[PDB]
Amino acid sequence: EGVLRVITRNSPATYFQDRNGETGFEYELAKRFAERLGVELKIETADNLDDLYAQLSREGGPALAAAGLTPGREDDASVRYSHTYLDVTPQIIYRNGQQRPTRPEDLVGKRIMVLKGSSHAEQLAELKKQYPELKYEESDAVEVVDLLRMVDVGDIDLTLVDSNELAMNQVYFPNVRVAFDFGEARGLAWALPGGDDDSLMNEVNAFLDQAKKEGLLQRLKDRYYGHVDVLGYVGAYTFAQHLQQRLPRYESHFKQSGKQKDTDWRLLAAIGYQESLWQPGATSKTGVRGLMMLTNRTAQAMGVSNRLDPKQSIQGGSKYFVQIRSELPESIKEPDRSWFALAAYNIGGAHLEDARKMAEKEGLNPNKWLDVKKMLPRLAQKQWYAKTRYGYARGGETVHFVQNVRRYYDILTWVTQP
Numbered sequence: 001e002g003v004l005r006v007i008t009r010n011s012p013a014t015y016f017q018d019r020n021g022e023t024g025f026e027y028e029l030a031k032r033f034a035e036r037l038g039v040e041l042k043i044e045t046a047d048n049l050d051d052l053y054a055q056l057s058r059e060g061g062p063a064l065a066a067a068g069l070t071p072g073r074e075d076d077a078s079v080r081y082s083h084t085y086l087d088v089t090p091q092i093i094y095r096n097g098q099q100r101p102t103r104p105e106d107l108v109g110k111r112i113m114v115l116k117g118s119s120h121a122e123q124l125a126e127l128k129k130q131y132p133e134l135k136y137e138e139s140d141a142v143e144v145v146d147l148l149r150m151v152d153v154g155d156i157d158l159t160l161v162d163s164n165e166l167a168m169n170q171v172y173f174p175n176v177r178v179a180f181d182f183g184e185a186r187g188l189a190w191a192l193p194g195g196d197d198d199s200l201m202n203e204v205n206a207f208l209d210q211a212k213k214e215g216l217l218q219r220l221k222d223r224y225y226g227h228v229d230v231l232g233y234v235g236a237y238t239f240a241q242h243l244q245q246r247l248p249r250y251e252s253h254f255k256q257s258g259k260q261k262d263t264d265w266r267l268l269a270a271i272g273y274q275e276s277l278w279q280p281g282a283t284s285k286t287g288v289r290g291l292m293m294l295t296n297r298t299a300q301a302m303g304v305s306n307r308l309d310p311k312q313s314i315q316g317g318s319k320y321f322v323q324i325r326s327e328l329p330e331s332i333k334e335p336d337r338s339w340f341a342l343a344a345y346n347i348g349g350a351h352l353e354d355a356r357k358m359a360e361k362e363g364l365n366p367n368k369w370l371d372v373k374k375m376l377p378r379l380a381q382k383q384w385y386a387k388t389r390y391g392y393a394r395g396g397e398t399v400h401f402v403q404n405v406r407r408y409y410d411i412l413t414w415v416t417q418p
């Protein structure tokens with residue numbers, strides 16, 4: 001009897017696969033709960049919001065939905081909502097360099113898009129009784145990340161989303177901006193079907209209450225909010241510079257790992273630079289640490305017993321990069337093979353293989369970096385990642401990682417001639 005089925009959205013704010021496996025706010029909260037129940041967690045992902053509620057309410061479907069949901073009516077007993085675990089405020093979003101709307105009326109005449117079946121579509125439905133001139137579009141083939149992208153690039157003028165979605169994604173869409181809060185703050189909650197037995201619901205709320213206080217929720221809220229992921233290019237002045245101040249402390253370790261693994265030490269050093277700017281005490285709330293930013297797991301798998309030791313960190317991250325490169329399909333030849341190895345280092349081999357399958361179906365060459373790097377940002381677009389085996393990944397940040405490591409590599413190559 002020991003298997004909790006939880007239905008969710010495949011999206012960065014809820015549940016997704018990265019290079020280490022499953023992750024996401026909802027995914028963890030649901031995992032720390034199935035642990036507290038002594039059962040196996042089975043994640044199931046819905047096609048869109050209507051379908052989530054449909055699967056929740058058909059027999060015999062999933063136990064609960066954990067998916068950043070805004071509770072509906074309390075006197076509707078068909079669906080029942082847990083206590084709230086996170087507070088958000090819906091926000092109108094516009095693009096920088098356009099007329100910032102200041103109040104609900106200003107939405108008339110703009111192109112507006114929201115997820116179909118959402119809290120946020122209902123808010124506009126309501127607003128449209130008060131202003132029949134309002135027009136807006138609804139879609140099941142987008143996620144909140146698509147909407148922000150569409151605003152960012154100017155394919156639509158405005159959207160409406162929860163503020164936590166904005167905290168999560170803002171950094172990856174430089175052109176987007178809050179126009180105004182549009183509704184009162186409210187708390188998200190898990191959704192269970194109604195309703196005759198309260199066994200589960202009572203356990204859910206005991207958990208969500210214990211997780212606040214005990215800090216668990218604020219723990220999570222901070223790991224994921226505002227977080228950067230892949231560092232920006234620092235420019236020639238700063239690299240300058242760290243070449244002078246930092247590299248000489250570590251060059252010998254890069255050179256020795258280079259010999260040991262029969263590979264260009266300058267590319268190892270470039271990775272290290274993108275990962276930590278050559279700082280052996282660097283860390284993230286995401287659980288990587290050291291000069292090459294290894295996870296505990298990857299560190300153990302590579303013989304690394306102290307992640308804060310530069311020589312060990314450099315030895316293990318390099319081993320990891322080189323093994324990833326060796327495991328790629330034989331049809332990928334150098335120099336592309338190294339660029340694919342960097343892409344997998346960041347996004348994981350599974351997402352990378354989906355991008356290669358996608359490229360093929362597009363009539364492109366799946367052994368060429370210039371082709372597959374065109375596919376990678378589509379893994380952030382629902383229309384595309386829903387047709388893939390591993391779903392969403394922030395593929396545009398993978399591309400940025402590879403480009404940045406190649407820029408540092410090219411400079412290092414230049415100052416190390418002839």
Ligand SMILES: C[C@H](NC(=O)[C@@H](C)O)C(=O)N[C@H](CCC(=O)NC(CCCC[NH3+])C(=O)N[C@H](C)C(N)=O)C(=O)O
Pocket residue numbers: 012013014025026049067068069070071086088113114115117118119120121144160161162163164165168188220221224225
């Ligand atoms: C906590 C977690 N996300 C986070 O980033 C963490 C860091 O805070 C989360 O649960 N997020 C969801 C994200 C996406 C979302 O906006 N989902 C919708 C659908 C999007 C509609 C926008 N056009 C919703 O709010 N509510 C559903 C529709 C509902 N009321 O049933 C949420 O805030 O909701």
